[PDB]
A paper describes a structure:
Aminoacyl-[name] synthetases (aaRSs) catalyze the synthesis of aminoacyl-tRNAs, which are crucial building blocks for protein biosynthesis. The ATP-binding pocket is the most promising area for the development of [name] inhibitors.
In comparison to compound 38, compound 36 has one more methoxy group substitution in the para position of the original 2-methoxy group. Compound 36 exhibited the highest PfLysRS binding affinity among these [name] analogues. The ΔTm of PfLysRS induced by compound 36 was approximately 11.8 °C in the presence of l-lysine. The Kd value of compound 36 was 15.9 nM in SPR experiments, indicating stronger binding affinity than compound 38. Compound 36 also showed strong inhibition of PfLysRS enzyme activity in the ATP hydrolysis assay, with an IC50 of 198 nM, which was also stronger than [name] in vitro. The ALK inhibitory ability of 36 was significantly reduced, and the IC50 was greater than 19.1 μM. The methoxy group inherited from [name] in these compounds were all bound to the hydrophobic cavity formed by Arg330, Glu332, His338, Asn339, and Pro340 like [name]. The additional methoxy group of compound 36 formed a new H-bond with Arg330. Compound 36, in particular, exhibited the most potent inhibition with an EC50 value of 736 nM, surpassing the potency of [name] by over sevenfold.
Author numbering:
A (entry chain A): 78 to 518, 535 to 582
B (entry chain B): 78 to 225, 230 to 518, 536 to 582
Write the structure that this text describes.
């Protein structure tokens, strides 16, 4: 019951074994069959049926230990998320290799073993390996936690391997994450898109609005910023004639952690020459509905928006999805007209007064972009929870890289998709007239590339972590990142 | 002639177009067919044949401008690395949408255009689009060079437009990564992401990038390798696991070293030394064949000014034991332990005698590595080969060699004297890892890491050899250069 003493005794056991001449960490066990392959090949065996002649080399982790006397021992053996029984019978044991009770009394829960033996089903119908020899391949020197010990605790995050071993669902969550990325890469590749890598460190940090990580480059004697987005170099590649280009990789925003924000997170951005806003809406509806159908066989999924203690809501990914104009909708809900320019003195004061009157946190500084974002967050971002929806046509002052709207003054051809109040996608017709990129008197290099001719283009960025959270029923981003950056205890 | 004046005139032209009510940057042109699709569909047309029953919308970048009289205008139009001719004839021009001469006088090299027209070949046989209307979609405001030596790295988009071998190099890079991903996935490997920043930086020997994490109020380190968290996933039961992504080593730049570079590492439970050798031989031979349809390639080891060599990727590859080959080539014997005062002095004397550069500090591992670099690592340029069985003191995470004292079951593959692969049987006895007696990694070992084999590949260097480049800046789209 004392974990410290358990580990001390296991450690002495290791030493005792090697100076009895047994190597508890051997170099190579030549495995013949994986546990999933074993289950696939011998599941249809009849009750009590043994393939006594069929000798197999199999490995796995012991996850349960019991006995039916000194003469017959039972274990659960797990590998690759699957499980079989180990039935060690005294009569099947190769006694030339050592005493039966001596070999099996040593085994502890968590030990990785290699087994030579034959396949069979017990009379009770349990698919089993019947050993003639089992050898310790690598010992578990600690007591493994119970599932209960992983529930309301940080052990899942600081010792993710324990989560993966003990909680069947944890493996499934991370398998789904990789299936999502695989689906996305194949979806883009089938449509002619070309995957690239752009630098993780740069002299500026552009393509979004976020505080950067800074690091010193020793050889250049220069401070560089980790990228906050891939947007600028990818557009430069469009100028270079890679007309469908994308990148899946980490980006970094040096701000506060919470349940939907991790400072390092996985983004996909793609740029599509000769596409516009409307192509990107259709792309999003095709992608999300096909992805959901690919994973689940239906367009509707269950999501516990308010945690596992509350009822799930159903999210319908059947397209098309609603589109909500941000300014028109704020004006309606607040019953207040917001006249252009949105950064005029009068319209600033009106937004603050709305925020004052409704007791909504005033952003600091109280800039027009920040006020609009705050108003959108409070009044529209939870308009729909039964289905994804787009917030569209953001003001130019919120959207310095999006192309001006072709009919609506002061607005852009921008869309953001929201699921359950959370943004997962940001896309727009790209601003490509260098004379309107106000900041091009923010990189000189980008600005200059625009002067060489950026074709009309649509670009889009996805939050892969947030998408995975919704498709694996998680409420916290730490449950979809293998090794979330924790406070060091 | 002047770039600056040319840009000013073009800028003034953009404003003048705006003042006349034309939007020189329209929002959307609905394209019917891509340029490569246009070539594939109409390549088999007969010389002089037109298909005026087929109106097509096509886009591209103008790369050449000429004319045969005021009545006929010719252009090169490029897209997706392919090219057609544009043949603007007064007869087919839609005059209701503007003056023919005035529309085409304005087009410059580099302009992105949309064209409504019909397919056809000229009498001379050149596949062409015949416009009834051409719309400027985005102007090139600078002069586009034809020839230009660091512009390639500081304006990679210019290199990609002009050079055509540059595009092919970066297509090959993505084909290499795609092949590797598919190669691993078909063998049951599971792709993951592990953190790019951590509280320590282990899995290799290199100086770190340091950054400050505002929310934790901690100084974190960019990863130098993915080795440690991937092994922790093996402990967690993901028995075949890999990651492809960037790692960071804060040291000097040269032609085969970039501080941020792309690595793939995989970990393979129950595999050992010999499985890793066979994986490497299978992967490299199949990758080369996939790209080239042969196992033999040409590589300009000493640049385009010197003769190339042939590299033969037909397996199996030679294996060379590091210590015994050093002893053979230098006719000495380096008695164990290698950090004995006698063996250090012996190694230092070989280096001093040959006027080779003495590493600072003159540590046993660094002396061994210098000796291998000067006496072994170019044993073959004919073919890749492995240097194997590195001493434990060079390899603190590799499992002890099962028959040779003081060594490990490690392998490094070299091409033309450059390492592209590092692999070994993983050390998994926690009591044998002297640093343990990273705490997170050391703790994970106490829960049981099965016997495992791990391997890392340098994707950038591999791409250099397979695209005939001598510098890593030629296979990275935006290599980080010294600024102004
Ligand atoms: C201002 O930006 C930040 C700032 C701080 C952060 O962590 C400290 C983060 N971190 C973070 N982590 C996971 N996901 C997202 N998504 C996300 C977040 C905001 C808006 C849109 C999206 S998005 O998914 O639609 C896509 C387009 C990226 N952000 C992002
Ligand atoms: C000590 O390590 C460093 C230090 C500083 C660096 O740049 C400043 C670098 N940069 C770098 N850049 C591209 N490739 C390689 N490969 C590479 C380099 C050395 C040995 C093996 C290999 S390896 O390819 O076999 C593979 C296993 C990684 N290193 C690497
Ligand atoms: N860089 C954007 C995504 C791409 C938007 C379209 N150019 C973001 O991080 O939100
Ligand atoms: N981390 C190693 C590659 C894997 C070595 C085997 N565990 C390197 O950067 O060279």
């Amino acid at each position: 019951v004392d974990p410290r003493l358990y580990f001390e005794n296991r450690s002495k056991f290791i030493q005792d074994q090697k100076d009895k001449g047994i190597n508890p960490y051997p170099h190579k066990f030549e495995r013949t069959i994986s546990i999933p392959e074993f289950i696939e090949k011998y599941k249809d065996l009849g009750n009590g049926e043994h393939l006594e002649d069929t000798i197999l080399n199999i490995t796995g982790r012991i996850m349960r230990v019991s006995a039916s006397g000194q003469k017959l021992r039972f274990f659960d053996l797990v590998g690759d998320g699957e499980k079989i029984q180990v039935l060690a019978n005294y009569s099947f044991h190769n006694h030339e290799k050592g005493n039966f009770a001596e070999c099996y009394d040593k085994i502890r829960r968590g030990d990785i073993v290699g087994i030579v033996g034959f396949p069979g089903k017990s009379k009770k119908g349990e698919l089993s390996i019947f050993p003639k020899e089992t050898i310790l391949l690598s010992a578990c020197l600690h007591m493994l936690p119970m599932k209960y010990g992983l529930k309301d605790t940080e052990i899942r995050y600081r010792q993710r391997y324990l989560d993966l071993l003990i909680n069947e669902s944890s493996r499934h969550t991370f398998v789904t994450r990789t299936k999502i990325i695989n689906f996305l890469r194949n979806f883009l590749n089938e449509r002619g898109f070309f995957e690239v890598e752009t630098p993780m460190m740069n002299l500026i940090a552009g393509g979004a609005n976020a505080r950067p990580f800074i690091t010193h480059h020793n050889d250049l004697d220069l401070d560089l910023y980790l990228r906050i987005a891939t947007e600028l170099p990818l557009k430069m590649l469009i100028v270079g004639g890679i007309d469908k280009v994308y990148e899946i990789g980490k980006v970094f925003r040096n701000e506060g952690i919470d349940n939907t924000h991790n400072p390092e997170f996985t983004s996909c951005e793609f740029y599509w020459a000769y596409a516009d806003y409307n192509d990107l809406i259709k792309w999003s509806e095709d992608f999300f509905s096909q992805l959901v159908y690919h994973l689940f066989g239906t367009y509707k999924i269950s999501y516990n928006k308010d945690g596992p203690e509350n009822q799930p809501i159903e999210i319908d990914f059947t397209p098309p999805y609603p589109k909500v104009s941000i300014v028109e909708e704020i004006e309606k809900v607040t019953n207040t007209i917001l006249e252009q320019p949105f950064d005029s003195n009068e319209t600033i004061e009106k937004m603050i007064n709305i925020i004052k009157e409704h007791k909504i946190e005033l952003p600091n500084p109280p800039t027009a972009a920040k006020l609009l974002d705050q108003l959108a967050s409070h009044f529209i971002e939870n308009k729909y929870n039964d289905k994804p929806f787009f917030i569209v046509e953001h003001p130019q002052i919120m959207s310095p890289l999006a192309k001006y709207h072709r009919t609506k003054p002061g607005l852009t051809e921008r869309l953001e998709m929201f699921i359950c109040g959370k943004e997962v996608l940001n896309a727009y017709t790209e601003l490509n007239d260098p004379f309107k990129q106000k900041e091009c008197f923010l990189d000189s290099a980008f600005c200059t590339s625009l002067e060489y001719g950026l074709p009309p283009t649509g670009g889009l960025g996805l939050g892969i972590d947030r998408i995975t959270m919704f498709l694996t029923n998680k409420n916290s981003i730490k449950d979809v990142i293998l090794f979330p950056t924790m406070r060091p205890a």
